Write a protein that binds this DNA or RNA. Sequence first.
RNA 1: CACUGGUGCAAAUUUGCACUAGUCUAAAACUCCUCGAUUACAUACACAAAG
RNA 2: CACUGGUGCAAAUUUGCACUAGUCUAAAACUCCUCGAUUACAUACACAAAGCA
Lengths: 862, 869
Amino acid sequence: KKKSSVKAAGMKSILVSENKMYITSFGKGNSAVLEYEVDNNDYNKTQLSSKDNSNIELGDVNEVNITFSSKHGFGSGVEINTSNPTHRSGESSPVRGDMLGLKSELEKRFFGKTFDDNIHIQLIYNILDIEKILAVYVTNIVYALNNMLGIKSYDDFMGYLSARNTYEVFTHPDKSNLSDKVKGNIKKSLSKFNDLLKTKRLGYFGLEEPKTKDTRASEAYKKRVYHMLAIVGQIAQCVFHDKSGAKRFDLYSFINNIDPEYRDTLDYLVEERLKSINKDFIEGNKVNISLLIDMMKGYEADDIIRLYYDFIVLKSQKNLGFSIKKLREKMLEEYGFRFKDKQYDSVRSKMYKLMDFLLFCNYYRNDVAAGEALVRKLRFSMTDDEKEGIYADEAAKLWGKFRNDFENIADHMNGDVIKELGKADMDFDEKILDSEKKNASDLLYFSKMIYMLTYFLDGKEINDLLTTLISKFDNIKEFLKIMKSSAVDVECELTAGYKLFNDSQRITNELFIVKNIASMRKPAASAKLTMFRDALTILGIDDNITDDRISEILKLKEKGKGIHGLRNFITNNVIESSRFVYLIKYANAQKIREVAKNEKVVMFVLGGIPDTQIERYYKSCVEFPDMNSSLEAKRSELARMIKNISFDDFKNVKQQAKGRENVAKERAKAVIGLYLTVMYLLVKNLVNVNARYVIAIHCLERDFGLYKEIIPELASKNLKNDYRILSQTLCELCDDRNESSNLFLKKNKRLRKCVEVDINNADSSMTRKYANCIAHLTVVRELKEYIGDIRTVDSYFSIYHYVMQRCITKRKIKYEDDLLKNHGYTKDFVKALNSPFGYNIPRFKNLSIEQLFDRNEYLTEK
Amino acid sequence: EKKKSSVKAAGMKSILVSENKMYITSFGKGNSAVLEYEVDNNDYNKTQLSSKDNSNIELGDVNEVNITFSSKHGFGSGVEINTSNPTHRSGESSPVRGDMLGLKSELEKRFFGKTFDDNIHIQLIYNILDIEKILAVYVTNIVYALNNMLGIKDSESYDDFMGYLSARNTYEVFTHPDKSNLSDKVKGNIKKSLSKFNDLLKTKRLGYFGLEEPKTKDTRASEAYKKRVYHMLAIVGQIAQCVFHDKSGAKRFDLYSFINNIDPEYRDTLDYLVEERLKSINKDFIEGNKVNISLLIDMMKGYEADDIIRLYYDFIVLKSQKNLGFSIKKLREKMLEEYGFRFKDKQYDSVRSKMYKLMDFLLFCNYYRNDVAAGEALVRKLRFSMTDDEKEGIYADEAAKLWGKFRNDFENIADHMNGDVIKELGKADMDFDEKILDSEKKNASDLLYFSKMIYMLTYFLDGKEINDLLTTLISKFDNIKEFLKIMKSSAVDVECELTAGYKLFNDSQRITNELFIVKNIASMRKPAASAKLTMFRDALTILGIDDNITDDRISEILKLKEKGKGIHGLRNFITNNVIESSRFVYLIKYANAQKIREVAKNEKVVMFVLGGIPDTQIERYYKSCVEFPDMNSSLEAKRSELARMIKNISFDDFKNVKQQAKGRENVAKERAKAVIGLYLTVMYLLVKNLVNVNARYVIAIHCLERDFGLYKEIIPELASKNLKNDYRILSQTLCELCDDRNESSNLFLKKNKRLRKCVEVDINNADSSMTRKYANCIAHLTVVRELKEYIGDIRTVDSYFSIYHYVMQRCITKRGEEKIKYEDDLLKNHGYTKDFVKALNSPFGYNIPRFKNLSIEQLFDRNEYLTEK
RNA sequence: CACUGGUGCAAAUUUGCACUAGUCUAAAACUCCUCGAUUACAUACACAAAG
RNA sequence: CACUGGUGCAAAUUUGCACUAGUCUAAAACUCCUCGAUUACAUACACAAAGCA
Ligand SMILES: [Mg+2]
Ligand SMILES: [Mg+2]
């Protein structure tokens, strides 16, 4: 695969105004450098960049081509030719519209008027991306909270919550002046809130009820939990339509408009995390700081301390424009293969932090130019191999300069030294970090709200949500900046709902810090009896087991020291496992254990895992390994082990193992790690496939509201009655009269009629069931029921479609007969169910055809 | 930037002018001339002499004022180039241009016995004049080095030792003058030289020239050794007699003939020196190069092993890779700079010369054998190139193509470049017969005596001196052979019979090839000699030791008397890092160890030398030499630290060095080697630059004596004049003739009245006494000898030229006579006087470019002020 | 920041500038080989050890 | 193995190919930050211990 020569050469964007064109080049990060202004009529050019700032030299410009060359050596200064974007056939305007044709309507909603430019729409599409990611996360969180109850038919208790109602009104609905019917809705949802608290399952999210029976602390805890759930419910109302087809418009303003008590909760949660990190930070990191201060002979100790705090909390090394971790991995891969020995496994995080910090200070302070040089090389790179080679070449240069330092760090990486350093006094003052320290008061409420949301998410979910949000705010701030520049000077005033986007630069910086602090391991909640039941059940246990029996086996009631080995082993390897929490939150322990019985599903997951990893698992988990075993034999053994696992296998585990006792203990931990990882891989992949469908539904509801204003035919229609209405209406018009604003259907007749055939196969009832199943994660909920039937498991996509197809046809549909017959998903059934997304051709083809669905599959394809 | 002549770039080598014809030549391979056209100077009719295949240029219109031509090979896509017709000159009746000096007719008579109405013979003669200029520099340096060795006291007798030697006397006459039939005065003069010769042998300093006396004291071996030394010294004295005049203004004319006319014992010595060198290279060459030959045979799949071995012998001894028309070293350097940065890693430092030989050998076979056409194309692009940046671009583009071809081979070479692999290849039994090289080996009998004489001269020289003398000689011989070949061709057919003393030049083609081999073998590291106590005293003294130290103390400190195992670490460390350093040998040869150590204390002088060194190199020196180095230090702070280290160095700092160091002790030993290396380099840079400055003045004196002798034949007013009586006589006489008689012989003076009047003011500012003292100081390297005496007095050390002139001016003004008028300003200023330089250089005024270049600091060095204008 | 030829502009006293050449100038003609040069260089890896 | 521009080919037509772009397509603009991912991740070496309605 080759990257764009225009992107590589340094050309970031060509913005089109009414009679002018603005050309930008890449600045640091996502910064745009205004280079030239070009008149669209006589092609006159004005350079806007300074000679020092300029990255590209503009050559001839004509109606069809733009010519430029890099000022920094890309392709040795060779001329590059790109299309003049104003040049399009059968289009009068130089500025193009969106494929959906909603550009004018969207500009009105966001800026209050239409514009003869393509800049505002680009910013608006970025905001739409934020809503798409929020819709996926709100759906997942709402489902997990419902699953925590054990719903059984979907009464969504999140639905009756309102961030508008204070905790007092929520606890006392008949103690206010609200609609009689409203009072009733609160009661129903207040019951479920008390039910959820009863389960103790909120402990999984780090939300632990108070140890004391203090009514004050208890109500304080309940009030914070109520605010979090109400805020989640409020976000869901903003990105999903109700039965009336209406959505709240205060997604970006509500956190600052609602009662201030909610803000106190957001402040409390952030303060709790920031206060612990900020308290005696030097004392808390004295080991690594002391080693760094001795090693970094060129630096002042207070400067090293300030840099280390940034490295931990601000993570400035993640804003260099290159991966420091990738450089460290390359160094160890080719030179430091010694540091990869199992001997350093116990100290691997600490060692990597020291190595990463030395590399960080090298490019952030000592050699900034080298960092900028490396970014330019990576930007100029045209293939993945070239990029890997650039990291490899730089690793060689880094190894020559730090190999002695890395070896010194390796020498200090041992319990003796680390324990000694921990005891050692650090003669340092607390107030050195007074300037660098970040506090809750320094963050906007929207950023604090995103931090709060992270409580319900695992590490990957936090990374995916925060990285997407940070990228969108970063793009939105750049667009506002270009528009407000003297050279461009376009109006761009956001309407009342979107005033938040004026602080996009601050939000991008704050969200970055939130991603860092949210990724840190939360203080563990005390393991509850319910958690122990989930842990025993996932492993395999008697369906009839009682709470009294579980407590006796784990000696939960008994008081004493060293008699809780089994309880400790289950807590350390199961309850505290991120994979286990993900499985409990989105699935059910008993159903997961049953699904694990299926070798076909298990083998499919095992097949995905790399061969060397499978070999490591085989060596670690099998008591009597067959050395001459084939890779398929190793996968089969691992699969059989997962099939026969049970709680009974770990009843005699010795937490305090000594000598060869350790061998059995280590084997038991490896087996549980492998079992939890495989089940987690299956459930996570299914939730991820489902998220693509959540996006389509969110877009369809969103697009319906936008088209409705510009399509008179849709005026009486309700989406909930028939999800196929947007694609159906748009299709007919195309065939009807060159009348359509949707470029996808209008431009492609074959793609327009293709969707029609699919729309006809569908029905209002089926599509409604599909929309409900997508939002309710029914495919994960009913995985055990139909998963066993599947004849062959070859993709998550095929697994998801078969289960959904069984849930939809359950008690007719035309495809039901071939479905139960074939024991495989029906492709045409998929196109039919996806018919409501026909209007968006790329989304419809990506979600309908397996080969196009996953960006990571079929890399070896031309 | 600087642009090359488009005429040269397009392919026109020269326009030879005869009485009625013009011959146009283009560039063939290397220095070869391709006769392209004959043009009649009257009707401008043209005849093509070149074949269609050989032709490199197409001649367009030719008229009285201009010549139009274009390249047949794509220069400027066939653009018309316009050059002046050389026969068109204002105020000149003849189509044939004269030399600036007006000595063309006299020079033609000296070399050919008659004058010629052509510009060809003179061009050949100017090449011969170039050979004499370079020889004048080297003999002056060798004679000074021999005098320095004697620890001379600069008495009346500088010339006694070398001056009284005669190549016409055998070793027997020189050693027993009383038994000769020579005159009583001559016998007396021989005894003064014999006494100095015995003094030279007594010093035991000849080991510095690789002329170590035999270990055994048998008379036969000792007499054979002394005889060889006498032959070498007599030959050097003979050469000095040929390029410099005596008190009477007389010089020998047998420079090119004497080696073949003197006693055969002299030729035996030349054969012995060459044979010793060639026999060691020739004996078991395959076994001696088995590591590289074994690796190359495994790698070079398309070549037979015997072919690789023959090519490898050529690569080491013949160096055919240095005759390709482009630099293999430059191509290899570019490849490493851009794509092979891993190869530049410090892990390869110990095997770098071997690794480079392997890489360079692959590039050599690629252009010499596999892709000859690629090499020819590369030469054409380089000839066509108009600027240095264009040339660098051509090398860079070719390097990119070579990297694609040779990346796997270069990686394979690097994989083998380690001690374990080299050690194993070293132990392997190589089944290749030495007889494979029977037809390729060069022997002493294959070389002319003149070539052997040049080899002999190399004993007295360092590597840079050998490269400078040999490259200059090879280039002049290459030019002379081309002019002779052109003249003897059927198309030109001009007589060109050299007179008897110059018949050697008939063999110029053979001499050019032989000197090339001499350059290769002479640049070969000589076998380490046995360090004498004298050398240990020089090494300890240069490092810094108390002046009263005794021979016994030195023998005691280094355990020279003691016999044992592992007790000689300090002696070995001094030998490996000081005695064996060519920088140290150069310093001892041209200066004294004690004076150099004293000069090293002048931080201003050290800072000036350190200032010339590139910043990346200073950073390497700071890292390697300073025990506790500040990371934050500025480049000027780093230079200052290095200068302070040089000022503070002493022998005492190294007395606890352990040769067999380990761990942290080893780091200290490496630091000690680094400090000594930096110290020797800085001092060497200072002394070498001053000797090089002095060489320019030596050339001026050589030219003045040569020019005075030639002008004496055509200027009646110079007939009763003795040059040594007043060095200003040629400049004064030529200027005076121009002003009144309108003398027209010297074009530099006749043409530029303003410059002639300026020279007259400078002659008037000087006098016979000062110019004679200046001539003596230049010939005796007085500036280098007296450097410690006056260098401390300089206020600002700005350049080598200003250092040389300040010291020179202090030497001229020193009392021992009326005060020179420039003395008061010189003493007050603490810097050289520009007017004083012009007055001292006034004897060279007759040659305006030389006078300006030697007088004006800005014009002196071709490598300085590249940006300025 | 040269010297000399050729060829132009311009100044204006006997000037300069520009372009362009020159193996028949200056350590000095293209490409090499060199030198500047530190980065040395060098038929034998480097150390160590010894003649 | 997409979608849409632009630019070429075409002999084959509602078409096809190649090259090439695209933040105004799709989870989808460079470099990051991420994800794929197993290799988890994580202010405090690891272990043990502390962890019931
Ligand atoms: Mg010459
Ligand atoms: Mg987008």
